Design a protein around this ligand. Structure first.
Ligand code: Y1G
Length: 188
């Protein structure tokens, strides 16, 4: 077959009931995740190949970066609760990996302040029980699939994308193969 288990995707041995339709895991410490955001725009390109209104979910993970990795999962919960993901994704990636100016929870907060989120608004979300629950949701979703690596995509709780089985001589072709595989899996 053109799409084969083990080539473009793998199949979870223990599928996850009630998982999001399209679920991405990433870390701001993750070098491939940086590339998936700024160089390849994987999420944008996957979204353009799926029907309108399809739910794409993106969660941060704890297992990269120690204390700061957990702070970043909480900050992503804040970004999700406030709806400011598109405002902070690039400054957070570049603060961690390009300029290396993010070293503390206060440095993360500065990114949100510079992006126009009010200090009281950020701090109130950071300490909120809604954010505590969003943190739990992200942890539970990664636990459900026993996640050991990022960037990762899962489709319908059953299929995991396999980007290493994909051609990387051309960045544009790679993105297209990845996006077309998600479409195929979403229709499976
Ligand atoms: O090097 C590869 O075979 C595929 C790949 C990955 C990747 C590999 C493993 C897990 C997640 C992603 O990221 C890339 C980014 C850019 Br630009 C170009 C290629 C890749």
């Amino acid at each position: 077959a053109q799409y084969e288990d083990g080539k473009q995707y793998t199949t979870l041995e223990k599928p996850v009931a009630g998982a999001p339709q399209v679920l991405e895991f990433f870390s701001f410490f993750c070098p491939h995740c940086y590339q998936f955001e700024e160089v390849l725009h994987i999420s944008d390109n996957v979204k353009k190949k799926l029907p309108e209104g399809v739910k794409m979910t993106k969660y941060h993970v704890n297992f990269m970066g120690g204390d700061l990795g957990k702070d970043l999962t909480q900050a992503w919960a804040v970004a999700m609760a406030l709806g400011v993901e598109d405002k902070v994704t690039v400054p957070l990636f570049e603060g961690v990996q390009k300029t290396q100016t993010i070293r503390s929870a206060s440095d993360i907060r500065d990114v949100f302040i510079n992006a126009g989120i009010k200090g009281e608004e950020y701090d109130a979300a950071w300490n909120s029980f809604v954010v505590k629950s969003l943190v739990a949701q992200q942890e539970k979703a990664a636990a459900d699939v026993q996640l050991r690596g990022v960037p990762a995509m899962f489709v319908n709780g059953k299929y995991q994308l396999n980007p290493q089985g994909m051609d990387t001589s051309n960045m544009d072709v790679f993105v297209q193969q990845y996006a077309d595989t998600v479409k195929y899996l979403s229709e499976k």
